Structure formats: C-alpha cells, structure tokens
C-alpha cells in the first residue's frame, strides 16, 4: 500500500509499506504478535474491535464500515448522517442493531402506531408496568388530536402583551 | 490488582468481592501484553470527579439515565478501573469540528 | 365541540401514564353499584331499574338528568359503574404474568427466590429495561424450587448467611385454561420423596401471596408501587363501563335492546350472585368451586374472548358473541 | 397509488411540517370535550357546566382540574381500557413530581 | 428500518441531539452544531506543503529586511520595519498557525486538506474584491493590529452555544476549532496584504460577512 | 418552568420553523377577518400580509421554546432576529 506521510522537509510524500490481509479473524491474538504495529491493526469486524478495543473504538470502526459501503459506489453522504446512526447504535455501551431488533418498537410509544393486529396485548403490559408515554411521536399525537412536538410543533405560540 | 497467567479457579474468582470498600481487579497477562489505549481507534478517556460529574449533569440538565453509556467490563473502563456510576469525558478528534467531547457513564 | 362554556383551563395532553386499576380506586371513582343484572320492568313498568343501564350512569330519553351534570346525550362523558365480585378472579390478559410472578416469588411468604447473595442474580437486577429484567429474573428463579434459608455469601463459601426465614418448597406451576396447578415434591427422582402433590392454585392464594411481596421485590419486576401492583392483576372489583361505551340499538321506544357488553355484565353478575347465595345459605365445598370457575369464565370472556370455550347466548339462540378485547377489530384498524 | 403512507409521513416529518402531518391524519371524528383530574389522569370528573362545579371524588379535588379536546375515538379507546381494569392517565404536564 | 430507528431524534434548543426519551445521542449535532445544507468543501491550506512553503506564506518578520511586508503592500509599510511591539503581535499569529499545522496533521493523518465546512471564505473574499473594485496596484490602508486583532475578535462571535457556564464555553470552543483553523489560514496578515490586497473597508466587510454566514449555517432547533 | 429574561442561552435568531408557524397562525387570523396591524399597501393574500407584519415587526406573539428538561424560555417575535 502507498502511504501518505510527512517527508523530512514537511510536505506529504508516498511511502510504500507491506500490509497483511487475512481470511479469518482473531484480533486479540494477532495483535500480540511481535514485529507488527498493534497501534494500527484493524478488522472489518467491528464487533471484535468493540470487545477488544472498547465501545469508543467500536464506534469508529462501525463508522468506517458504513462509510466504505457507501463510498464503494463513489457516493457521498455528509458525515453527520452516518455519525448519527453510528451513535444511536452505540449509546448504550454496546452495538445495537437497527434492523428491527425488538419484537416491540424501536423507540416508539404504546399509544403510537397500532402495530400488530393486537395492540391490546401491548396495552396490558404497559398497564402492568406503569409505562409512561412522553407523547412526542406523530401517531400518538394524532390519536390525541394534537400536533407532534416536532419541527414546527417543537415550541408553543402565545399572545404577547408588551407590544404597545 | 491481581495479574495472573492462564486463568483462575472459579472458586477463587468468588473471593474478590469480600473486602469493602477496597476493590480487587484481575488481569490476564495476555490482555496486558498490549496497551489498548495506545490504539488509533481508542480516544482519550478521562475519569471525572464526582464534582465534575455534578457540574456535567447540572449544565446539560440531564438525569443519569440520559447520558451515553459505557459497559463496566469495557476494555477501557477495565483499564481505568471504572466503577458503576462514574463518568468519563471522551476527547475525540473530529473531521467536522476540531475536537468533540462526549461523555459516558459506567454501567 | 359543545358550545357550552367551561371555566376549566383548556390544555393538551403532554404525557400518558399507564397502570392498573386498584380495587380501592375502582370504588373511589364509581357512582352506582349494579346489583340487579337487568333493566326496566320496575313492577312491569318499562322504565329503568336502579340496577343497570341507569342507576347513576349516563342516561337517554332526551333527559338532561345524569348525576347533576346536565349536558346532552352527545356532550356527556359517561360515568363509570361499579360491581363487587364475591371471589377474586384472574384477569384474562395477565394469567401469563401471574404465572411467572408466582414462579419468581415463594408461594408461601412472598419473598424472591433469589437475591443479592447470588452473583448471577445481581447481573439480572442491574438490567434497566423492566421487561428485560423481569425476564432475566424469571429465568433464574423458575429453576429454584426451594426457598433457601442460608446461602454462601460473596465471602468464604465455607460460611453461610441467612436470609428469608422461610424454607418451604416450590411448585412447578403449569396452566390449564383459566386455572393454575402446582405440583410439589422433594428433589427430582429420589427415594422417600417420589410422587407429586398436584393441587390447583386458588385465585385467593395467589392474590394473598402477591400482597406479601415487598415493594423492593415487585419493583425488581416491572411493577410500580403507585400505578401497578402485582395483586392488581387479580380482579376483586370490576369497573362497569357507562352506556356511551356500550350503547343500546333501540328504535325510538317500547323496544329494549342493549349492547352485547351489557348482556355479558349481566351474566357476570348472575354467577356472582349464585356464588354469594351459597356461602350465605351454606353450600358444598365443590359446589362453590363450580360457580367460582363460572364467574371467572364470564369475567375472562367479557374482557377477552379467547380461552377454553365460545360462550354464545345473548338473547339469541343463534349464539353470537362480542367482547372488549375484540372491540378494536374496527378501532385499532380504523385509525 | 395515490396515498399518504408511512413513507410519505417520514418525509413530511423531515421537512418539519407538523401542522400538515396533523391535518392529513386527523380522523373526521368529533373533537369531543372531556374534563380530567390533575391528580389522576382519568376522565372521572363530574362536570356541572351550568352551576360551574367540577368535582372528582377519590381525590377530594374540585380545583385542580383541566379541559381537553380529543377525538371521540380516543375517548372510547380509553374507556375501553378502564373497562379492562387498565388506567390510561392523561397528564397536562411533562415534568412530573420529578 | 433506518427511518424507524432514528425517527424520533431531533435537535433541541440547547443544540443537543436527543431521542423521545430525552436521552442524549450527541451533545451537539454532527459534533459541530451545523446544518449540512450550509456546508461546503473548503481546503485547509495550513496542513499541506513543505515547511518552507508554509513559512514563505505565513511568516512576517518586521525585524528582518528580507521578511517584512514590503512598503507597497501597506501604507505603514516603511515605518513598520523593526517595530518590536507589532512583531510580538505577529509572532503570536505565527505560533498559532504553526500550532494548527500540528493539530490538523493529527486530525487528518492522511494529509487531506479539502474538507466540508460552513462559510465559504474564498468566495466572500473574491466578492469583496469585486464589490470594492480592489486594485492590486496600490498599498492597503490596513494596520497590522487591524488584521490580527480583527481576525481574533471575529472568532469570539461565531456562536453555536451561548451558555454562560464553563462547560458550554469549552464545548463552544471545540465545535468551532476546525473552522477557526481555516479562518486563521485565510486571514493571516500576509495573505490579507500580499495576496488579497484587501483595504480596511473590504476587510471589515469580509469579517461581518463571515459572522452573518456562520450564524446562518447553524442548525435550527426542531430539525428532524 | 420559566427562565428569567436574562440568562437565556437559546438563539437570538428565529428558527425557520418558528417563522413558518408564526406566518401560518397569523395568516389564519387574517383570513378570519381579524384586524391587521400593518398598513395594507395593496396586499390581499393573508400570508402575504402576515409576512409584511413580520418584517415591520408588528406581530404580538411570543414563542415558548421548551428545553428537554421541562424548563422553557420566552422570546417575543419582535425580539427575535429574523434572517433565514
Ligand atoms: Zn353525565
Ligand atoms: Zn419462602
Ligand atoms: Zn381524580
């Protein structure tokens, strides 16, 4: 691989380096092998990076992976959108999937979208658990006949008594 | 801090939590042959004092449950001997702004 | 909406707190008592008995009268009824929960089968998701079928540490429709302890054991000491939905015709009465247990028709049947 | 085609057009007017609109009370919950006793 | 599945990104609190090139007959020579740029200089020149304190967060670190006098513009 | 839970949303024969008028920006700097 490095004079120059790509992964152990650079080892398995290098490291790999999948077709997406997704997937100190993990919701409310032919069963559990609906979703606010606290509804408008 | 070689007897393992408030930590040599915190992908983690911690929650006006989390047995938390309820300021480089500082509370 | 005026400040719903209706509350907010599971014919007089459909709840007949509140038959928020049950009854929707909870707490003193003295239990108690915790705890406690008195502490396994002063064994609870049965024994496959003691768990045992469970315990589960207490999954006082909920398709006058949910409330009350008119006039042990299950069947079918049968007998030999669980078949699907 | 489905909703959400979202999804049902206790989020308030007397027993409340407008479908959906021994407490405030 | 999972995440009034539960997902949106449609790919010059090229472009030494600003680039040109007090100011600016070069080379190990940012500085500059018909044939009327102090003052007004406490003020310095490294490389005294040939008027205009655009590029609370 | 007119950390600038809802609410009142505060120099379209009122700063409205913790800040339309 050609590597962009600062030349002794300051300007970046390409310096070739031998790199090893492997079929199979055992990060914890290969990393320990002498003669390599443990500081720069990597793997497309973000899961192993997480269990071995920590959540934060995991987040960065999870990002690099998503990024490549898109940069693969020469496409571009502002960093903030993939960064957002990667953060959601990492907030709880673990790697939570986005593809309908929970058999119930993702981050919705009981009174929200009448998912499943039986919303009643979801209501029973809510009752037996003292579930508290914040009422920030659209559907839940629809049933309540109100606009959701989103964008244009993220604030209230009141008459002013100062203007002479 | 107890650094062992291959492993410990499950019997002996249940001998750690037994001398409060003093805490005992275990490390397998293999897991120390390399300092993970010296890795590109691993940003700077800084244990915050209960003071800073209070200051942190006060300004962003947050409940402890609203802060991002980090697992107790997380490699870095294990490194800094983090204890549940403790917060770490994570100083990472950003391609958007210069630096970006995030926070994680040890679960 | 309703051109009449109201001094009450108009606002929008910001939060929705779910929970369970406690028996004390269903009483503290009721109006009537609904004793007579019938209507009209006050001495052959087609009016409205103070038993059902009008004792104090919303009215009809273009009568503004309705517990000194006025308003029309369209601007009135039906007032909820009240109806005491002779015996406790499992709520259809919670038989599954009630089963697991029973397997988590000791069926004698009501103490959790596992606590902080178990390293695997602690990892479960730490779970935040009340749903994931209840699960992780039930998976650990359903195995234990003995209420330990002394357990080895984190310290020297040599020494023990006492906890729940109770030590009786637990039953391997299994479901059989609307009832729970517990099987006892002394260690699986061993001498001088073979053969099980199978007996059905009465609604009263469960309810009373649930009342001995500490706040720390049912909170360890997804329960809330203010909105949802375990015991409340067992009904003792059923809320009677006002007429606006369950109407009455009657053309003008003379004709009766009341909603299919009122017909059910009638039969529920009936059985409840034939159950009280036995403990009063003295009755056989197995005889009462008959009405009990009957009542259960009606209280269960009312809220949710999907158990051990298809009760169809509402003023029609054709055998039709509706309920509340199956009422959103055009409400949770219309919105 | 010709429909306003889940994907059309996500779009307007990203645009931030909450009014439109509410307008396009509000069922024709009457915006019924109900009264609710500030202690219990229940519709157990007996409203005497002529004599001006709102009283909710079980809570000894006559002052701390509110008014709301919700489609009848909701009013019913809630009474059905109450009927099934489930309390759908509606609160006008977010920051509870917390 | 992507929509469903991220559907309730919104930017709140504190510049924080949170979900319906109110959990913090990002302490500031996109770690810069900026709206993506106001971001343009701009090159961070300071990072690339040889050290000589870096010094030939930014270094200003009034105490050196060969590295001062020729009197033709500025009126006070000839009397600036050997001005101890200004040089102290000019060394502050250089040390800051040299710091940035380090900092940038750490953030972009690759050495990549082109990165998307708010407020296209190059354009504001070209516009200024057109708007004020700047002629490269006359010495500017800008004082050195004008450039340095001016560029310095502007960095104090590019606001993302306004909280008066310590934590926020620090979060506010981090979120504008990169743009600020860009700014300093584009409004370095020598660049202002030797390359752009801006006048006191043109220059002053450029500053207020960057401020108006910066504030204008900030994300709006309510964004889904 | 109320925040003094001082110590407000929120933006001095109006958000595109705030402006959109203000132009929408105000236009609803104008379309309902509600009085106008700006000299109608020809305009007849309610929104077109609402916008004229926003520019001349004659809309007696106040935006209550709530913070995620429950508290809130009160900004007057007049006060808010409009530049979107
Ligand atoms: Zn009434
Ligand atoms: Zn026991
Ligand atoms: Zn009440």
Coordinates of N, CA and C in Angstrom, one line a residue, chain C residues 25-143:
Chain C
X25 N -59.5 2.0 44.1 CA -59.8 3.1 43.2 C -61.0 2.9 42.4
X26 N -61.3 1.7 41.9 CA -62.5 1.5 41.1 C -63.7 1.8 41.9
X27 N -63.6 1.8 43.2 CA -64.7 2.1 44.1 C -64.7 3.6 44.4
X28 N -63.5 4.2 44.6 CA -63.4 5.6 44.9 C -63.8 6.5 43.8
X29 N -64.0 5.9 42.6 CA -64.4 6.7 41.4 C -65.7 6.3 40.8
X30 N -66.4 5.3 41.4 CA -67.6 4.8 40.8 C -68.8 5.7 41.2
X31 N -70.0 5.3 40.8 CA -71.2 6.1 41.1 C -72.3 5.2 41.7
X32 N -72.5 4.1 40.9 CA -73.5 3.1 41.3 C -72.9 1.9 41.9
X33 N -73.6 0.8 41.8 CA -73.1 -0.5 42.4 C -73.5 -1.7 41.6
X34 N -74.5 -1.5 40.7 CA -75.0 -2.5 39.8 C -75.2 -3.9 40.5
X35 N -76.4 -4.1 41.1 CA -76.7 -5.4 41.8 C -77.6 -6.2 40.9
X36 N -78.6 -5.6 40.4 CA -79.6 -6.2 39.5 C -79.1 -6.2 38.1
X37 N -78.8 -7.4 37.6 CA -78.3 -7.6 36.2 C -79.4 -7.6 35.2
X38 N -80.3 -6.6 35.4 CA -81.5 -6.5 34.5 C -81.8 -5.0 34.3
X39 N -82.9 -4.7 33.6 CA -83.3 -3.3 33.3 C -84.8 -3.2 33.1
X40 N -85.3 -2.0 33.3 CA -86.7 -1.8 33.1 C -87.6 -2.7 34.0
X41 N -88.9 -2.7 33.6 CA -89.9 -3.6 34.3 C -89.9 -3.4 35.8
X42 N -89.9 -2.1 36.2 CA -90.0 -1.8 37.6 C -91.4 -2.1 38.0
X43 N -91.7 -3.3 38.3 CA -93.0 -3.8 38.6 C -93.8 -3.8 37.3
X44 N -93.2 -4.4 36.3 CA -93.9 -4.4 35.0 C -93.8 -3.1 34.3
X45 N -93.2 -2.1 34.9 CA -93.1 -0.7 34.4 C -91.8 -0.6 33.6
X46 N -92.0 -0.4 32.3 CA -90.8 -0.3 31.4 C -90.2 1.1 31.6
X47 N -89.4 1.2 32.7 CA -88.7 2.5 33.0 C -87.2 2.2 32.9
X48 N -86.6 2.0 34.1 CA -85.2 1.8 34.2 C -84.8 1.5 35.7
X49 N -84.6 0.2 36.0 CA -84.2 -0.2 37.4 C -82.9 0.5 37.8
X50 N -82.8 0.7 39.1 CA -81.6 1.3 39.6 C -80.4 0.4 39.7
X51 N -80.5 -0.7 39.0 CA -79.5 -1.8 39.0 C -78.5 -1.6 37.8
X52 N -79.0 -1.6 36.6 CA -78.1 -1.4 35.4 C -78.6 -0.4 34.4
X53 N -77.8 0.0 33.5 CA -78.1 1.0 32.5 C -78.5 2.4 32.9
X54 N -78.8 2.6 34.2 CA -79.1 4.0 34.6 C -79.0 4.4 36.1
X55 N -78.7 3.5 37.0 CA -78.7 3.8 38.4 C -78.1 5.2 38.7
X56 N -77.1 5.6 38.0 CA -76.5 6.9 38.2 C -75.7 7.3 36.9
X57 N -75.3 6.3 36.1 CA -74.5 6.4 34.9 C -75.3 7.3 33.9
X58 N -74.7 7.5 32.7 CA -75.3 8.3 31.7 C -76.7 7.8 31.4
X59 N -77.5 8.7 31.0 CA -78.9 8.4 30.6 C -79.3 8.6 29.2
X60 N -80.5 8.3 28.8 CA -81.0 8.6 27.5 C -82.4 9.2 27.6
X61 N -83.3 9.0 26.7 CA -84.7 9.5 26.7 C -84.7 11.1 26.7
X62 N -83.7 11.6 26.1 CA -83.6 13.1 26.0 C -83.6 13.7 27.4
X63 N -83.2 13.0 28.4 CA -83.2 13.5 29.8 C -81.8 14.0 30.2
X64 N -81.8 15.4 30.4 CA -80.5 16.0 30.8 C -80.1 15.5 32.2
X65 N -80.9 14.8 32.9 CA -80.6 14.3 34.2 C -79.5 13.2 34.1
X66 N -78.5 13.3 34.9 CA -77.4 12.4 34.9 C -76.4 12.8 36.0
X67 N -76.8 12.6 37.3 CA -76.0 12.9 38.4 C -75.6 14.4 38.5
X68 N -76.6 15.2 38.4 CA -76.5 16.7 38.4 C -75.3 17.2 37.6
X69 N -75.3 16.9 36.3 CA -74.2 17.4 35.4 C -74.8 17.9 34.1
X70 N -76.1 17.7 33.9 CA -76.8 18.2 32.7 C -76.2 17.7 31.4
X71 N -75.9 18.5 30.5 CA -75.4 18.2 29.2 C -76.3 17.2 28.4
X72 N -76.1 17.2 27.1 CA -76.9 16.3 26.2 C -76.3 14.9 26.0
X73 N -77.1 14.1 25.4 CA -76.7 12.7 25.1 C -75.5 12.6 24.1
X74 N -74.9 13.8 23.9 CA -73.8 13.8 23.0 C -72.6 14.6 23.5
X75 N -72.9 15.4 24.6 CA -71.8 16.2 25.2 C -71.6 15.7 26.6
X76 N -71.9 14.4 26.9 CA -71.8 13.8 28.2 C -70.8 12.7 28.3
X77 N -69.8 12.8 29.1 CA -68.7 11.7 29.3 C -69.2 10.7 30.3
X78 N -69.8 9.6 29.7 CA -70.4 8.5 30.5 C -69.6 8.3 31.9
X79 N -70.4 8.2 33.0 CA -69.8 7.9 34.3 C -69.6 6.4 34.5
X80 N -68.5 6.0 35.0 CA -68.2 4.6 35.2 C -69.0 3.9 36.4
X81 N -69.4 2.7 36.2 CA -70.1 1.9 37.2 C -69.3 1.3 38.3
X82 N -69.8 0.3 38.9 CA -69.2 -0.4 40.0 C -69.9 -1.8 40.2
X83 N -69.1 -2.8 40.5 CA -69.7 -4.1 40.7 C -68.7 -5.0 41.5
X84 N -69.1 -5.3 42.7 CA -68.2 -6.1 43.6 C -68.3 -7.6 43.2
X85 N -67.1 -8.3 43.3 CA -67.1 -9.7 43.0 C -67.0 -10.5 44.3
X86 N -67.8 -11.6 44.3 CA -67.9 -12.4 45.5 C -66.5 -13.1 45.8
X87 N -65.8 -13.4 44.7 CA -64.5 -14.0 44.9 C -63.5 -13.4 43.9
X88 N -62.2 -13.4 44.2 CA -61.2 -12.8 43.2 C -61.2 -13.6 41.9
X89 N -60.8 -13.0 40.9 CA -60.8 -13.6 39.6 C -59.6 -13.2 38.7
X90 N -58.9 -14.2 38.2 CA -57.7 -13.9 37.4 C -58.2 -13.0 36.2
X91 N -57.4 -12.0 35.8 CA -57.8 -11.2 34.7 C -57.2 -11.9 33.5
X92 N -58.0 -12.1 32.5 CA -57.6 -12.9 31.3 C -56.2 -12.5 30.8
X93 N -56.0 -11.2 30.5 CA -54.8 -10.7 29.9 C -53.5 -10.9 30.8
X94 N -53.7 -11.3 32.1 CA -52.5 -11.4 32.9 C -52.2 -12.8 33.4
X95 N -53.0 -13.8 33.1 CA -52.7 -15.2 33.6 C -51.3 -15.6 33.3
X96 N -50.7 -15.2 32.2 CA -49.3 -15.5 31.9 C -48.4 -14.8 32.9
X97 N -48.6 -13.5 33.1 CA -47.8 -12.7 34.1 C -47.9 -13.3 35.5
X98 N -49.1 -13.5 35.9 CA -49.5 -14.1 37.2 C -48.8 -15.4 37.4
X99 N -48.6 -16.2 36.3 CA -48.0 -17.5 36.4 C -46.5 -17.3 36.7
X100 N -45.8 -16.5 35.9 CA -44.4 -16.3 36.1 C -44.1 -15.6 37.4
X101 N -44.8 -14.6 37.8 CA -44.6 -13.9 39.1 C -44.6 -14.9 40.2
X102 N -45.6 -15.8 40.1 CA -45.7 -16.9 41.1 C -44.5 -17.7 41.2
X103 N -43.9 -17.9 40.0 CA -42.6 -18.7 39.9 C -41.4 -18.0 40.3
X104 N -41.5 -16.7 40.5 CA -40.4 -15.8 40.9 C -40.4 -15.6 42.4
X105 N -41.5 -15.5 43.0 CA -41.7 -15.3 44.4 C -42.2 -16.6 45.1
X106 N -41.7 -16.8 46.3 CA -42.1 -18.0 47.0 C -43.6 -18.0 47.3
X107 N -44.3 -19.2 47.0 CA -45.7 -19.3 47.2 C -46.2 -19.5 48.6
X108 N -45.4 -19.0 49.5 CA -45.8 -19.1 50.9 C -45.6 -17.8 51.7
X109 N -44.4 -17.2 51.7 CA -44.1 -15.9 52.4 C -44.0 -14.7 51.4
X110 N -43.9 -15.0 50.1 CA -43.8 -14.0 49.1 C -42.5 -13.3 49.0
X111 N -41.4 -14.0 49.2 CA -40.1 -13.5 49.1 C -39.4 -14.0 47.8
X112 N -38.6 -13.1 47.2 CA -37.9 -13.6 45.9 C -37.1 -14.8 46.1
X113 N -37.1 -15.8 45.2 CA -36.4 -17.0 45.3 C -34.9 -16.8 45.2
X114 N -34.5 -15.6 44.7 CA -33.0 -15.3 44.5 C -32.9 -13.8 44.9
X115 N -31.7 -13.5 45.4 CA -31.4 -12.1 45.8 C -30.0 -11.7 45.5
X116 N -29.5 -10.7 46.2 CA -28.1 -10.2 46.0 C -27.0 -11.2 46.4
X117 N -27.4 -12.3 47.1 CA -26.5 -13.3 47.5 C -26.1 -14.3 46.4
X118 N -26.6 -14.0 45.2 CA -26.4 -14.8 44.0 C -25.8 -13.9 42.9
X119 N -24.5 -14.2 42.6 CA -23.8 -13.4 41.6 C -24.5 -13.4 40.2
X120 N -25.2 -14.4 39.8 CA -25.9 -14.4 38.5 C -27.2 -13.6 38.6
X121 N -27.7 -13.5 39.8 CA -29.0 -12.7 40.0 C -28.7 -11.2 40.0
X122 N -27.6 -10.8 40.5 CA -27.2 -9.4 40.6 C -27.1 -8.9 39.1
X123 N -26.5 -9.7 38.3 CA -26.3 -9.2 36.9 C -27.7 -9.0 36.3
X124 N -28.7 -9.7 36.8 CA -30.1 -9.6 36.4 C -30.8 -8.3 37.0
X125 N -30.5 -8.1 38.2 CA -31.1 -7.0 38.9 C -30.7 -5.6 38.4
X126 N -29.5 -5.6 37.8 CA -28.9 -4.4 37.2 C -29.6 -4.0 35.9
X127 N -30.2 -4.9 35.2 CA -30.9 -4.6 34.0 C -31.9 -3.5 34.2
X128 N -31.9 -2.5 33.2 CA -32.7 -1.3 33.3 C -34.1 -1.6 32.7
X129 N -34.2 -2.2 31.5 CA -35.5 -2.5 30.9 C -36.3 -3.4 31.8
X130 N -37.3 -2.8 32.5 CA -38.2 -3.6 33.4 C -38.6 -4.8 32.7
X131 N -38.8 -4.8 31.4 CA -39.3 -6.0 30.7 C -38.1 -7.1 30.6
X132 N -36.9 -6.6 30.3 CA -35.8 -7.5 30.1 C -35.3 -8.0 31.5
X133 N -35.6 -7.2 32.5 CA -35.2 -7.6 33.9 C -36.1 -8.7 34.4
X134 N -37.4 -8.5 34.3 CA -38.4 -9.4 34.7 C -38.1 -10.8 34.1
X135 N -37.7 -10.7 32.8 CA -37.4 -11.9 32.1 C -36.1 -12.6 32.6
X136 N -35.0 -11.8 32.7 CA -33.8 -12.3 33.2 C -33.8 -12.9 34.6
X137 N -34.8 -12.4 35.4 CA -35.0 -12.8 36.8 C -35.8 -14.1 36.8
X138 N -36.9 -14.1 36.0 CA -37.8 -15.3 35.9 C -37.0 -16.5 35.4
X139 N -36.0 -16.3 34.6 CA -35.2 -17.4 34.0 C -34.3 -18.0 35.1
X140 N -34.0 -17.2 36.1 CA -33.1 -17.6 37.2 C -33.9 -18.2 38.3
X141 N -35.1 -17.6 38.6 CA -35.9 -18.1 39.7 C -36.9 -19.3 39.4
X142 N -37.2 -19.5 38.2 CA -38.1 -20.6 37.8 C -37.4 -21.9 38.1
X143 N -36.1 -21.9 38.1 CA -35.3 -23.2 38.3 C -35.4 -23.5 39.8

